[PDB]
């Protein structure tokens, strides 16, 4: 009953998620090789066939929209995942909604780890590695919002979690019952509760030498809250001095506020 509740969690996840934390860390080890992006020609070369939109402008903004691409496509995977908890999708619609829009970009930074290494990051299914002294190397307020990206992703890494974990985590996040708005409160934090619940009782069996490691993991659920108010933060600024750079339209609702 509590561990059909983390299997069913474990695979929304699966059938949900295409890149996996499996996939990823395979793909950076070497098991099997990926195109690395790092500078304008290489961009291209990834963007013709080989790896892979508003019109070209410059190198800055033209990854700040494949940003936004990203996230988009993490947006619509991450709906179907909470749709497919059953506990959520009995929630009213408009409370399911509000639930998204606060908890997206939390979780997604979370998933962001699994997919990132001190170097760099995956893209497009693993297929490309842009790296980190490329994006770096951008303009000044689109290198800001990337590179606090890796120094959460990297500590959160250090804890080792697999997607097993991952799953009930992100489950954890988007049932947050104090976002602004909710109608039914009470009804989304005894979801939560029983999610962290089966989470705890699964980082027993799943890793017995973790001292900590709930608690910890707690911690870090804060922690994104604040990644994502100082990611928040840039893009609204992003909005006012980059008057010529666009805005994908969900992502004007999520951060509508
Ligand atoms: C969700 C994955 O997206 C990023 C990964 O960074 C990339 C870097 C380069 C490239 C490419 F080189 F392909 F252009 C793609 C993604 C993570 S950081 C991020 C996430 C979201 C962002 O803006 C959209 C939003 O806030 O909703 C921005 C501006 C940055």
Not at 83 to 92: D, E, G, T, V
Request: glycine share 4%; net charge neutral; aromatic share 10%.
């Amino acid at each position: 009953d509590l561990k059909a509740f983390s299997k069913h969690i474990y695979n929304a996840y699966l059938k949900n998620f295409n890149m996996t934390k499996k996939k990823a860390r395979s793909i950076l080890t070497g098991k099997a090789a990926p195109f690395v992006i790092h500078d304008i020609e290489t961009l291209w070369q990834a963007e013709k066939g080989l790896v892979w939109l508003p019109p070209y402008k410059e190198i800055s903004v033209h990854v700040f929209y494949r940003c936004q691409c990203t996230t988009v496509e993490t947006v619509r995977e991450l709906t179907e995942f909470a749709k497919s908890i059953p506990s959520f999708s009995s929630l009213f619609l408009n409370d399911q909604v509000t639930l998204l829009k606060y908890g997206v970009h939390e979780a997604i930074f979370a998933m962001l780890a699994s997919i990132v290494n001190k170097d760099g990051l995956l893209v497009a299914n693993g297929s490309g590695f842009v790296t980190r002294e490329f994006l770096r190397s951008l303009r000044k307020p689109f290198s800001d919002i990337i590179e606090p990206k890796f120094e959460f992703a990297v500590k959160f890494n250090a804890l080792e979690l697999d997607d097993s974990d991952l799953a009930l985590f992100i489950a954890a996040i988007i049932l947050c019952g104090d976002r602004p708005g909710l109608m039914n409160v009470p009804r989304v934090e005894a979801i939560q509760d029983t999610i962290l619940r089966a989470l705890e009782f699964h980082l027993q069996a799943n890793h017995p030498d973790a001292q900590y490691l709930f608690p910890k993991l707690l911690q870090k659920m804060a922690d994104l809250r604040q990644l994502v108010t100082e990611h928040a933060q840039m893009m609204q600024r992003i909005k006012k001095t980059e008057t010529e750079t666009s805005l994908h339209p969900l992502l004007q609702e999520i951060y509508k506020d």
